[PDB]
Design a protein around this ligand. Structure first.
Ligand SMILES: C[C@@H]1C[C@H](Oc2cc(Cl)cc(NC(=O)C[C@@H](CCC(=O)O)c3ccccc3)c2Cl)CCN1C(=O)C1CCCC1
Length: 259
């Protein structure tokens, strides 16, 4: 691409993100003083493991659905073959969700927006996966220290998704070309806004991958303890992506990709 084309891709990506971001940043920021009470926190801590897992899976599924829509609107993604579309979303959708989540994280009091108010990580004690929760909060705290603009989140999450190293890609070169163009757009935008100093401070890829594998592991542990809960009350998209015995999702996401 030339320079006009790179800048055109920057605004295309930022638009696709804006149209698919699920929660508006201003809405999240206006709620920061709305903080769960002691009594409400205790109420969450008293819920059963399986009901809290069910609520979390519901919320992650909705977030993943917006990430699928982001991808469908992302320049060049629907021109990839359908095998590679699904490989990229299976490997990348949760990573994109985890990055988007820092927008709902308040670094000043270490709280997150959840079901109407902000609370700290003690809200989630009933899940019985505190080590994973702490890691997610720490990751979000590190991202918050970079002070991402919405445009930077757009460009960065596009690259999280368009990763030409994902195993299973059939047209590896076509994905490499898209990734390189999106890399130019990202770096051009940082150069133009004098923000290149964040590049060295972005998390290594191993970190996002560690969080998602831990998510699957804790999930599989919970499923082994409550198998019928996962079968009867978890969203089909989540079940197929992540659960033991899951089909793999190729069919729900293939049908989201067409609609
Ligand atoms: C879901 C949550 C994320 C949770 O802690 C965090 C951490 C950080 Cl950085 C940000 C947010 N908040 C948000 O992004 C906003 C809320 C709004 C929900 C609403 O519409 O009311 C949201 C939207 C979309 C997806 C998830 C959450 C939360 Cl909740 C911890 C627990 N759990 C998990 O994954 C656990 C469960 C099992 C495996 C790990």
């Amino acid at each position: 691409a030339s320079l006009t084309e790179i800048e055109h891709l920057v605004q295309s990506v930022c638009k696709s993100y804006r149209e698919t971001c699920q929660l508006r940043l201003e809405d999240l920021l206006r709620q920061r003083s709305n903080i769960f009470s002691r009594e409400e926190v205790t109420g969450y801590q008293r819920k059963s493991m399986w009901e809290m897992w069910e609520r979390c899976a519901h919320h992650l599924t909705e977030a993943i659905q917006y990430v699928v829509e982001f991808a469908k609107r992302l320049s060049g993604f629907m021109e990839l073959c359908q095998n590679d579309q699904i490989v990229l979303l299976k490997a990348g959708a949760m990573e994109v969700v985890l990055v988007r989540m820092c927008r709902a994280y308040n670094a000043d009091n270490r709280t997150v927006f959840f079901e109407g108010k902000y609370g700290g990580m003690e809200l989630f004690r009933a899940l019985g996966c505190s080590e994973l929760i702490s890691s997610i909060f720490d990751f979000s705290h590190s991202l918050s220290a970079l002070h991402f603009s919405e445009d930077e989140i757009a460009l960065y999450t596009a690259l999280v998704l368009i990763n030409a190293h994902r195993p299973g890609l059939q047209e590896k070169r076509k994905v490499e070309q898209l990734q390189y163009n999106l890399e130019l757009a990202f770096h051009h935008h940082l150069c133009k806004t004098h923000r290149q100093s964040i590049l060295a401070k972005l998390p290594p890829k191993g970190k996002l991958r560690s969080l998602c594998s831990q998510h699957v592991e804790r999930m599989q542990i919970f499923q082994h303890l409550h198998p019928i809960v996962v079968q009867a009350a978890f969203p089909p998209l989540y079940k197929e992506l992540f659960s033991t015995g899951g089909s793999g999702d190729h069919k729900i996401i293939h049908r989201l990709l067409q609609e």
